[PDB]
Design a binder for this molecule. Structure first.
Ligand SMILES: *[C@@]1(O[C@@H]2[C@@H](O)[C@H](O)O[C@H](CO)[C@H]2O)O[C@H](CO)[C@@H](O[C@@H]2O[C@H](CO)[C@@H](O[C@@H]3O[C@H](CO)[C@@H](O)[C@H](O)[C@H]3O)[C@H](O)[C@H]2O)[C@H](O)[C@H]1O
Ligand SMILES: [Ca+2]
Ligand SMILES: [Ca+2]
Length: 175
C-alpha cells in the first residue's frame, strides 16, 4: 500500500464536476469558499421518483495502492442525508459499472469524513447495465466518484479536499 495521501480535488483548479438529474429532481454546483481556499457547493431539489448527482469522471482508475477516500463536508438548511458513490468502469465500453455507496449527512460544521474502501456497500436501489455483478469493489477499475441523492428532500452542502488516504507511515516490517 501507499503511505500518505493523494489529492483528487482540492477545488482550487479545473472544474471537474458534471451534474445530472431526472424525473423533476435538480442539482446545480458552483465554486464557493471552502474548508481551505475554495470548495464546491452542491444545491439540490429531490423529488419522489427523481434522482440527482454530481460526478467527477477520473483520469486514473487504479486505486489499488490506497486504503480510504476522504473529503471535507458541511451543510450550508435542514440536515439531510446524501450518498457518496464510487462507480467502477463498465464491462461493455459504455456507461458505468458497479455502484458502491456510503451514506453521509452534512452538518453545520466542517467535518472530515474518511471512508475505508471496505466500508462501501454495494448499491441496492440501482445498478447500471454495464456492472460486473461481482459484488466486490474492484479498486483497479474505478470510473468516477459522485455526490448524489439519498431521498426525495432538498438541501445545500459544500465539499472540499477530496483525497485518497493510504497507510499512516512507512514502518519497519517484522521479518
Ligand atoms: C450519469 O452519466 C454520467 C455522464 O453524464 C458522464 O458523462 O460520465 C459520468 C462518469 O462515467 C457518468 O456518471 O451517470 C449516472 C450514474 O450511473 C446516472 O444516474 C443514474 O440514472 C438512472 C436513470 O438513468 C437512475 O435510475 C432511476 O432512479 C430513480 C430514483 O430512484 C428511479 O425512480 C428510476 O426508475 C430509475 O430509472 C439512477 O438512480 C442514477 O444513479 C445518470 O443518469 C447519468 O446521466
Ligand atoms: Ca479547497
Ligand atoms: Ca465489481
Amino acid at each position: 500500500s501507499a503511505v500518505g495521501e493523494k489529492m483528487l480535488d482540492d477545488f482550487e483548479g479545473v472544474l471537474n464536476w458534471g451534474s445530472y438529474s431526472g424525473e423533476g429532481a435538480k442539482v446545480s454546483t458552483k465554486i464557493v469558499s471552502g474548508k481551505t481556499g475554495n470548495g464546491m457547493e452542491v444545491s439540490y431539489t429531490g423529488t419522489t421518483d427523481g434522482y440527482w448527482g454530481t460526478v467527477y469522471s477520473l483520469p486514473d482508475g487504479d486505486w489499488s495502492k490506497w486504503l480510504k477516500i476522504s473529503f471535507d463536508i458541511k451543510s450550508v438548511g435542514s440536515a439531510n442525508e446524501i450518498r457518496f458513490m464510487i462507480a467502477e468502469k463498465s464491462i461493455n465500453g459504455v456507461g458505468d459499472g458497479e455502484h458502491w455507496v456510503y451514506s453521509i449527512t452534512p452538518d453545520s460544521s466542517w467535518k472530515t469524513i474518511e471512508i475505508p474502501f471496505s466500508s462501501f456497500r454495494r448499491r441496492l436501489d440501482y445498478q447500471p447495465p454495464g456492472q460486473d455483478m461481482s459484488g466486490t469493489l474492484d479498486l483497479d477499475n474505478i470510473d468516477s466518484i459522485h455526490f448524489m441523492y439519498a431521498n426525495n428532500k432538498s438541501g445545500k452542502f459544500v465539499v472540499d479536499n477530496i483525497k485518497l488516504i493510504g497507510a499512516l507511515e512507512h514502518h519497519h516490517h517484522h521479518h
